Ligand binder design. Structure first.
Ligand SMILES: CCCCC/C=C\C/C=C/CCCCCCCC(=O)O
Lengths: 49, 49
């Protein structure tokens, strides 16, 4: 979700950070995120994710 | 609106089901330690902007 992009960072909390995808704080690397509404969203709800 | 919070357990995993927060920034404390702490005099200041 768009609101959860802030959770993809070292030392974060939330459902994504805690239960799905966790980053170290000794993390060297780059986080990239971009909107994909035109691709991953369809009428009636895309429930594949 | 300022509201006092006292004598309760701050699980804050009940907010994962429904609430999605655009911004969540913590000062003076890491978000990962909030489950392992107790808070002395807690006030919630609520408004709309
Ligand atoms: C209204 C009662 C609040 C009392 C709690 C007091 C101190 C503990 C602070 C807890 C963090 C606030 C909830 C944030 C939920 C995580 C959001 C996310 O998924 O990123």
């Amino acid at each position: 979700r768009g609101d959860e992009v802030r959770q993809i960072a070292p030392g974060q909390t939330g459902k994504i950070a805690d239960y799905n995808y966790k980053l170290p704080c000794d993390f060297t690397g780059c986080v990239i995120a971009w909107n994909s509404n035109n691709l991953d969203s369809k009428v009636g709800g895309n429930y594949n994710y | 609106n300022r509201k006092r919070i006292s004598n309760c357990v701050a699980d804050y995993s009940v907010l994962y089901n429904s609430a999605s927060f655009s911004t969540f920034k913590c000062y003076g404390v890491s978000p990962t330690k909030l489950n392992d702490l107790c808070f002395t005099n807690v006030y919630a200041d609520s408004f709309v902007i």
